[PDB]
Amino acid sequence: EMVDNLRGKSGQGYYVEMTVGSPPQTLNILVDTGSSNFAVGAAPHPFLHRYYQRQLSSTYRDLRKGVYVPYTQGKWEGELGTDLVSIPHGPQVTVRANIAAITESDKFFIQGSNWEGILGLAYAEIARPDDSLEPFFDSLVKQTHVPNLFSLQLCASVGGSMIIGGIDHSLYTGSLWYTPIRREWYYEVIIVRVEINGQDLKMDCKEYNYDKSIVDSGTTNLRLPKKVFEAAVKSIKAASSTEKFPDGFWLGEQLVCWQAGTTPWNIFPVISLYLMGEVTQQSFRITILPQQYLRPVEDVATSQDDCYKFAISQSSTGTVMGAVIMEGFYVVFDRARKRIGFAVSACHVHDEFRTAAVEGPFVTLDMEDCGYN
Numbered sequence: 275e276m277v278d279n280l281r282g283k284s285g286q287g288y289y290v291e292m293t294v295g296s297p298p299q300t301l302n303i304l305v306d307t308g309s310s311n312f313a314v315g316a317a318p319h320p321f322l323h324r325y326y327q328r329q330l331s332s333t334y335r336d337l338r339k340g341v342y343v344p345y346t347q348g349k350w351e352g353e354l355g356t357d358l359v360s361i362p363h364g365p366q367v368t369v370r371a372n373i374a375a376i377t378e379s380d381k382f383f384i385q386g387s388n389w390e391g392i393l394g395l396a397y398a399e400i401a402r403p404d405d406s407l408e409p410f411f412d413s414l415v416k417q418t419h420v421p422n423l424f425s426l427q428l429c430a431s432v433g434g435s436m437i438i439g440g441i442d443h444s445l446y447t448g449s450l451w452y453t454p455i456r457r458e459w460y461y462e463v464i465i466v467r468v469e470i471n472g473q474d475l476k477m478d479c480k481e482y483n484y485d486k487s488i489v490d491s492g493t494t495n496l497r498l499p500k501k502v503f504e505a506a507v508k509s510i511k512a513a514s515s516t517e518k519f520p521d522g523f524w525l526g527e528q529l530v531c532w533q534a535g536t537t538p539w540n541i542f543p544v545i546s547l548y549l550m551g552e553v554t555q556q557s558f559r560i561t562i563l564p565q566q567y568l569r570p571v572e573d574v575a576t577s578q579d580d581c582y583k584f585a586i587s588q589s590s591t592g593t594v595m596g597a598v599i600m601e602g603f604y605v606v607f608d609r610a611r612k613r614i615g616f617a618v619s620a621c622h623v624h625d626e627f628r629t630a631a632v633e634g635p636f637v638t639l640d641m642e643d644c645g646y647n
């Protein structure tokens with residue numbers, strides 16, 4: 275009953291239905307492995323269909339403390355409190371959890387996204403105002419018998435599944451490969467190698483993780499450190515040089531469009547990210563097709579064409595493996611064993627020539643630690 279419990283619009287996040295308060299108020303909540311605060315719209319806003327009414331909840335408790343959360347995209351401020359929370363299409367449990375009631379925001383809520391709140395699934399270490407504000411998943415595990423693990427299968431309308439407390443074998447094929455959670459704050463991982471159509475970018479592997487690499491369902495793009503970004507774009511340009519695009523396309527400032535049904539997928543390369551294994555000097559790779567990193571932009575005005583944004587972009591805060599990377603993989607956040615597992619999803623991306631893949635093992639001769647710090 276947890277399969278197909280996520281919905282979304284492309285580029286706008288994936289969300290799960292939740293209830294807050296007593297009697298229960300239903301809200302759609304974006305699933306975010308890149309933050310650790312649970313927060314809901316709690317005042318009218320132009321892009322909110324509905325919001326949390328604390329005055330109607332007899333179980334609401336005010337903590338008399340404000341909070342401010344800035345993301346890469348957007349920011350909000352609100353009042354901290356606690357209340358009862360359920361997940362109708364999740365484990366049938368009720369937990370009392372910290373909730374930030376958002377009362378002001380800037381560029382956070384998205385016109386027509388269908389969600390009214392955000393569920394930060396990462397660790398206390400990055401919660402605001404500080405790590406004493408226990409995150410939702412921690413409360414769920416402490417207060418119920420739910421095992422300390424969840425999995426995400428992310429697939430304009432989109433869908434997928436969040437399996438809370440377990441792994442659903444019907445959602446993936448082949449083997450699950452595990453990479454260590456380096457540090458419990460973000461879901462921090464280590465990238466050891468990057469290839470563009472099988473050609474190594476040939477950088478010191480620390481560059482891939484300058485200054486951290488994270489797995490983030492709340493960010494859309496694959497975001498890369500400047501030096502890695504520039505090298506990657508050069509290589510993708512070279513692979514695709516049968517066609518020439520404006521510089522603005524490569525910067526995400528501009529769409530690329532082709533007559534409907536004629537997108538030349540085959541001129542764009544596959545990107546392989548090699549992730550650190552659980553054993554010394556071993557790795558595995560996840561392979562990303564252009565159908566993942568060229569993100570379709572739905573717009574009836576442009577619909578004689580298929581139009582796309584380049585969904586790899588630059589970062590000054592390390593690698594972000596966003597939703598564009600997670601799509602078509604089954605990703606297991608195995609908190610109990612401090613590891614992240616990847617497998618090919620039941621909704622994997624593939625055409626008649628190429629397929630997304632998770633494969634290993636690979637060995638490196640180079641004994642260098644790829645961690646930046």
Ligand SMILES: CCNc1cc(C(=O)N[C@@H](Cc2ccccc2)[C@H](O)CN[C@@H](C)C(=O)NC2CCCCC2)cc(N2CCCC2=O)c1
Binds near residue numbers: 347493
């Ligand atoms: C799905 C929306 N698309 C979209 C959202 C974000 C974004 O900032 N996502 C946040 C959630 C969200 C979801 C929806 C709306 C706003 C924010 C994540 O939480 C960000 N995760 C990390 C990187 C972070 O900044 N964590 C903070 C650290 C400080 C303490 C709080 C957590 C970024 C992009 N970007 C930015 C450039 C390229 C890209 O894809 C596109």
